[PDB]
Amino acid sequence: GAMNSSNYAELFNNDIKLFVDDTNVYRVTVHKTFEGNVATKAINGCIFTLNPKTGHLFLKIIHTSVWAGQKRLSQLAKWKTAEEVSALVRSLPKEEQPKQIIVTRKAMLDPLEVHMLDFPNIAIRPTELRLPFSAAMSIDKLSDVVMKATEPQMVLFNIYDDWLDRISSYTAFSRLTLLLRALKTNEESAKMILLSDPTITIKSYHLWPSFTDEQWITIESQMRDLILTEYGRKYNV
Amino acid sequence: MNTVPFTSAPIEVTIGIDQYSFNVKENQPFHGIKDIPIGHVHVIHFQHADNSSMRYGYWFDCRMGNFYIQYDPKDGLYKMMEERDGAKFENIVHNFKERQMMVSYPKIDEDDTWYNLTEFVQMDKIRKIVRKDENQFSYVDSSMTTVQENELSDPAHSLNYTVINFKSREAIRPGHEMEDFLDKSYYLNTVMLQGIFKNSSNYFGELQFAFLNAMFFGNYGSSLQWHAMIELICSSATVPKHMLDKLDEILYYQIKTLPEQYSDILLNERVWNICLYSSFQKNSLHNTEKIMENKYPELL
Ligand SMILES: O=C(O)c1cc(-c2ccccc2)no1
Ligand SMILES: O=C(O)c1cc(-c2ccccc2)no1
DSSP: OOBOSTTOGGGGSSSOEEEEEOTTSSEEEEEEOTTSOEEEEEEOEEEEEEOTTTOEEEEEEEOGGGGTTOSOHHHHHHHHHHHHHHHHHHHSOGGGSOSEEEESSGGGHHHHHHHTTTOTTSEEEOBSOOOOGGGGGGSHHHHHHHHHOSSOEEEEEETTTTGGGTSOHHHHHHHHHHHHHHHHHOHHHHHHHHHSOTTSOBOTTOSSBOOOHHHHHHHHHHHHHHHHHHHHHHHTO | OEEEEBSOOOSOEEEEETTEEEEEOTTOOOOEEEEEOTTSOEEEEEEETTEEEEEEEEEEOGGGOOEEEEEETTTTEEEEEEOOOHHHHHHHHHHHHHTTOSEEOOOOTTOOHHHHHHTTOOHHHHHHHBOOTTOSSEEEETTOOBHHHHHOOOGGGOBOOOOOOTTSTTTSOTTOHHHHHHOTHHIIIIIIIIIIISSHHHHHHHHHHHHHHHHHHOOHHHHHHHHHHHHHHHTOSOOOHHHHHHHHHHHHHHHHHSOGGGHHHHOOHHHHHIIIIISTTTTSOHHHHHHHHHHOTTTO
């Protein structure tokens, strides 16, 4: 069934599972036309498919050519997402296939269920967590690969860098969600927090800076302050 | 015209014959129903006065045999039986017809209601949904489950309706997932009509039989099947014009006949609002839409 805060530790047990977020699949800019009407222009998007235990991110880049000459693009995007997740599962060896796929938006349930009929033992579930995965495109190296793509492409990342050498997957996911929530709430301020000290850098093969354990405590506290600050500005508190 | 005679009526019971019903008192001198129109299937159904649990009944066709009803005090119900002795049957029936111990099937001459509800229903198809090959008539009751219900538990006592499931491999061609899920025309025309039912008349017959079992017995799985067969047509972009026009007639007379006070339990709001107002065929059911809006506007 649904996934929430009561069964939160289930994300870090030994049953393979993937989160699928479709927020960034169909992305547009809205603009005026010469005649004063409004038009959309699509830009490249991505499917965010994440294993929360290992940090493995299957980023399928959605190139704007997939929309050419198609109708009802917001509906099509859900079915394209489900098509691509199904193709990913079929490409994985049996012992790597998930036992559960958790979708961040309930509108993905029927498209994914229909594309996965051949896998009746893979559970397709919603979640009551409000997960900030839309902010993935605020991670510079992810945004760069998506915008430079000239054709469909799958790129593999570990979204936890090397953190699991030092912390549990529960703690790593909690850090990721806090970082993404901060980037979603005030992107410029969050990146300033992450990059302000030029002596701490991002390794070529990483997504985030090489903070020590104590520096991650400081960063996490700065991110929580940013979020609370923004909540106060929003609601006049 | 034919006759279903009763040996006796030892327990108080409401007796239905098609869309008609009447009450018989405990040990009243009731000996059956006469003037039953030849040319249609019929259903004779029962609800005991002292225990309204289990509505039950029998589908039959007087052209296929001489049927009489007798109360079984061991199993506690009125049973349909076939009499193979033709002369005995006529002799007992005549004695009863002469002493005016039968009610008359009360058909008004202007009235096509029963034909309109059973136009596509044939006994041979009933006997494949309800499997009891030793009898020419078919028993149905309120609690009987369907094959689909039993997959999601005595198979000998089940309603073998054709399984319809919109999220099944039968309904969805590999490679046509979005197409087939949003437009059920493949499933309707190739899988169901060409493949399983062979023609629209058999499809409508099963739809009409499902409705009648839901209405007369309160059989829940029958109601599910009736709604699924409507939704399958309405959710298809490509349906032969003659089928759409016939479906409008079929549903109009079903909605016309439904007891007003049974609507909360016999009509699925989601299915009807989808079919009348959102589906491909939302503008193809003019007669049904008009009666639904004037008779059950709350549902919508
Ligand atoms: O063989 C029997 O037990 C039998 C036949 C009948 C019957 C009664 C009324 C009319 C037609 C047939 N009742 O019992
Ligand atoms: O066996 C027959 O042929 C028979 C029995 C009856 C009968 C009818 C009414 C009351 C009692 C018996 N009529 O014919």
